[PDB]
Write a protein that binds this ligand. Structure first.
Ligand SMILES: Cc1ncnc(C)c1CC(=O)N1CCC[C@H](C(N)=O)C1
Ligand SMILES: [Zn+2]
Length: 139
């Protein structure tokens, strides 16, 4: 589990979205596994606007933050799950690091702010759905 709270927005994994996220849907993209919904309370998370390839992520399954090097946002093929058939997921960044199903939602951060959230994993690799290109989250 895990979300990003910026302004009047809540960003979550699309596969983890609630009935309330869908009833107040702003934008959603299956190819990215992202869903943004509106909120009444104001969010204080800062989104990074950068091209960093190093950061720190929160790993729920170990209650630890881990430093990682991560690839640039791209189309990476993701194995079939109870949420999606086997497809290419776009805007995905990979890193060598631990992840278990249940770790989706954990935030990835650099010195500039919030980079993205855990979205894929397995084989000792972890995937992060990037949010830095979503310039509208700040307006
Ligand atoms: C299998 C597995 N191992 C280790 N870590 C994780 C997070 C996972 C879970 C994972 O990769 N999923 C399941 C939920 C939907 C995801 C998606 N973006 O399509 C894919
Ligand atoms: Zn950065």
């Amino acid at each position: 589990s895990g979300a990003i709270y910026v302004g009047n927005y809540r960003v979550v994994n699309r596969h983890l979205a609630t009935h309330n996220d869908w009833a107040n849907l702003v934008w959603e993209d299956s190819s990215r596994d992202l869903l943004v919904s509106s909120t009444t309370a104001q969010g204080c998370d800062t989104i990074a606007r950068c091209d960093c390839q190093t950061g720190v992520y929160y790993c729920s399954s170990r209650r630890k933050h881990y430093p990682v090097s991560f690839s640039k946002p791209s189309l990476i093929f993701v194995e079939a799950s109870e949420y999606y058939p086997a497809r290419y997921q776009s805007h995905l960044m990979l890193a060598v690091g631990h992840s278990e199903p249940g770790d989706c939602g954990g935030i990835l951060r650099c010195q500039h702010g919030v980079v993205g959230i855990v979205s894929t994993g397995g084989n000792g690799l972890v995937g992060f759905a990037d949010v830095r290109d979503l310039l509208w989250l700040d307006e």
